[PDB]
């Protein structure tokens, strides 16, 4: 009878990553409506897709116009005005030189699968450089190059070099030590001439919202590029204005050969894209096909996302409003010693929970999960990430308001204090742990 | 528009994402027709390859999409149950025969659904081997292409442990039903022990392989040979599913009782949506095993509910048998005028026309001739494609809402296009760019 109980009976566990009992019947602005009518503040952005919140007029108009006058349902078969104009848009807002082209897909997973498939074929090189903790997708091709603990049920693609992502909060490995490790692999067991590409998250997402040390990723890029290794930046998570600039890679001085877009590009509709040089992206006809990719409904939604971000200056606003939210969370740390760090850029914010500030020992996952659950009871939706399952993740809609930040901060404040005073029971969160 | 949409597409769209059969470049769509830039209204016999099951601007789909995008119940089923997606899953369980506990996973495409299927079948069964068919097309992502047998993906080696068998083809009958079963029995007795085989993947009509309907009883005998050893039986309904063949599921023509069914294309009505229906012990194998952020989002799943509801309410399975029969028969009678029409096969509104350079040998027509027929179709006001291991089978997958007057308009256009091409009235340079 309850939506949540119905879900339990028909939805497959393989597709669940559920942090709380929240079960939804609608949304409006930056709030989500639980079954029963309770209005929850969404600090999750549904993990990134909901860039403009829910029921946003620009996305609604674009999707209305397109589904009523539908310009086919397959870019592979038929050019349509929305998908071609979106590609034009993406080339216009993404700096780059030479001839470049755009491929469309449904998800970050399929866009990285495309990237891997076309890069290895255009180079006929089979080795790939990526990062421990990197999350590039959960389909066979994109999972295969990912380094995240969650996909260790399956072996990596052969010839993947996994490096530590240098972490300024837990600096086991300095930038310099990681580059030296790469250099040593290049001179030995991973000759750079047999490497197709390096894959870079400009902030390490599911690995724990780790902003790398300054200048490291520009130095990585330059080391790879000397050997004609193509430089791929995954902007799926932190892309499109969220970090204070249009592309997170613009913080890091990068000039990538290829950019992968997803999540928030769709504004809550499935939409991904790969932008690369024409010589790679025109490798062969009919090489990476999905029937409804580049369909006029999802692409029209993507055009509205980009248009709103530019016209309303949501990059600058994410810097300002994210600074406010970040600073509110830092102040909570004078109250709650479990807050060890507040990091990220703009409206991509992670809060690192520690059981001890000295050692920076991560707080146990049970505590982290209980804070989420308690936040849900108090009226906010969020999640956690990190290689130690201890980093609270805030990825709210870019439309988040200053009064909502106040509300968010008070909820987080209360949920931490409650959980630390033993408010939430083990059996309440057992359902949402693996 | 001096800068045509076609030209703009050439400047910015990746060739890897193209499978273009004509210059048709779109600004809209209405009913069963597509609107070319400049305004010309084209009859859609392609159904955009299957997704457009109810055509374009269909009011049930328009309504579901409007309500969901305006009042959006989150955008991620992996994070949050939503009413649309839970209800669609309930709908798919209800309309798909099956026994015991079952569950539903959602995705965006046939390719991601079959990737899911292969990943979870091997993991849950603890068997590594897969049975598939030569010419089968289960997708174009790494995991789904890996179990596929089609000639377009021979640029990449298959997944290790895949046994590829011929699909018995009544029109080019190199391999009988009995011969294929014998060959499988032989592999089972030697180098492919059947207790190491997770699953067999079955297209109930071989789609990109040439719209081949198997010989009667073959698929049921294949099911039984595999099931006898605990091999799970997977039917791919992505292409010919959901009423198009005259029954709700194409496998219901073939006496099949699958363990797992894969849906896509038309399920979404033009929005991206796929699904896998499987037994609970497989589908609940582990949490967070096959995740895609926006899968099961309330917009795409609402569109799917509208598709299924319209198909049941308006009786579109029953209609497609009747209307597809009329269309198929028009096409057959065209073989009296045009000897290039070697066969018309299919079920319901999944129809293939096999073009041959010789009626006796059944040698496939050259691909340049087939491309010219599509191009001339397009100029005459109809959009269609070709398929097949020899690039010679005209494909007709129109919206299930295709009208009887549109069937006459279609048959006439095809008739005129074949005639104009055979009489040497279509240039080589006009099709050069689509091959
Ligand atoms: C979420 C994510 C992906 C995968 O996107 P899906 O839409 O979940 O398949 C890929 N790369 C990064 C950096 C991500 O955060
Ligand atoms: C088209 C098709 C697929 C793949 O669907 P996409 O949405 O193009 O990835 C899978 N199986 C069959 C039988 C198909 O016809």
From TrEMBL, chain B:
The answer to whether keyword Phosphoprotein applies is: no
Cofactor(s) needed, names only, are: pyridoxal 5'-phosphate
- UniProt-listed InterPro entries: Aminotrans_3 (IPR005814), Aminotrans_3_PPA_site (IPR049704), PyrdxlP-dep_Trfase (IPR015424), PyrdxlP-dep_Trfase_major (IPR015421), PyrdxlP-dep_Trfase_small (IPR015422)
One Pfam entry name: Aminotran_3
Q: Which UniProt keywords apply?
A: Pyridoxal phosphate
PROSITE patterns given for it? AA_TRANSFER_CLASS_3
One GO molecular function term of this record is:
transaminase activity
Q: Where does pyridoxal 5'-phosphate bind?
A: 110-111, 293
For this protein, the record's SUPFAM superfamilies field holds: PLP-dependent transferases (SSF53383)
- N6-(pyridoxal phosphate)lysine (covalent) occurs at 265
Describe the family membership recorded for this protein in Swiss-Prot or TrEMBL: Belongs to the class-III pyridoxal-phosphate-dependent aminotransferase family.
Q: Give the protein's recorded name.
A: Amino acid amide racemase
The record's gene field reads aaarA
